[PDB]
Amino acid sequence: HSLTPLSMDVIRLGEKTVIMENLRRVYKNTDTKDPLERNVDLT
Amino acid sequence: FEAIFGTFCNRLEWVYFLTSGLAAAAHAIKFHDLNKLTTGKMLFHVQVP
């Protein structure tokens, strides 16, 4: 069991530090739609 | 008499393409056999993730 240092953006909000992530790079030029952009219906 | 004081000429300032800031948008190349070629192509190969 070992750890690897890597750099990512962090927001500090209410005594919690949270990682901020943006999965654009996974779905770019791929055939699969990014699931974080969706359709929301209203009647 | 009529006096002719100094006669002057247009001391024009020149412009050079590579001194222009627009040249940043260009990668300028000199080729002496340009009169001979008529086609220039660049081929791209890309496999999607």
The CA-to-CA distance between both ends of chain B, in Å, stands at 90
Record: contact B48-A31, CB cut-off 8 A: yes
- What is residue B27's three-state secondary structure? coil
Q: How far is A30 from chain B (nearest CA, A)?
A: 5
What are phi and psi for residue B19, nearest 5 degrees? -80, -20
Nearest CA in chain B to A31: B49
| A18/A13 Cα distance (integer angstroms) | 8
Approach to solving: cryo-EM
In Å, what resolution does this model reach? 3.3
Q: Which residues of B touch A24 (CB under 8 A)?
A: none
- Alpha-carbon span B30 to B18, nearest angstrom: 13
Q: Using CA atoms, how far apart are residues B16 and B22, in angstroms rounded to an integer?
A: 11
Strands (DSSP E) found in B1-49: none
Q: Which two tokens stand for residue A17?
A: 């530090």
Residues A7/A20, Cβ–Cβ less than 8 Å = no
CA distances from B40 to B19, B31, B44, B48 (A): 27, 13, 14, 26
A23 contact residues in B (CB cutoff 8 A)? none
Using DSSP's 3-state secondary structure scheme, residue A27 falls into helix
**Chain B CB contacts of A30 below 8 Å:** 48-49
Across chain A, how many H-helices and E-strands are there? 1, 2
